[PDB]
Amino acid sequence: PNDITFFQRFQDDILAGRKTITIRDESESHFKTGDVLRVGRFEDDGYFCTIEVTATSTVTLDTLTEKHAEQENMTLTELIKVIADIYPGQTQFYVIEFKCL
Ligand SMILES: Nc1ccn([C@@H]2O[C@H](CO)[C@@H](O)[C@H]2O)c(=O)n1
């Protein structure tokens, strides 16, 4: 079973180490530094890697930074657009920093 999923269009970015954080809402605020997590694709729940959580922090819509976007391998405009679709109306988020094992 997978502990967490990503949209499959992020799979290669994660395996290549271009994406090293993910921004989630309260439903995934329980992941914490030192967790070792099985990761699957959102679309088919297919496993593709195991990650280690290396850091966590809280962030809000109005405190997301260019650097958060860079670590998501996005522009900031791109990151805000994805959040507006995935977490409509939400402002409180949780940063999970990780590495692919
Ligand atoms: N920063 C983020 C936030 C969410 N997600 C994907 O969207 C699903 C629903 O939140 C999540 O389960 C996850 O698959 C993502 O890929 N990257």
Ligand SMILES: [Mg+2]
């Ligand atoms: Mg959109």
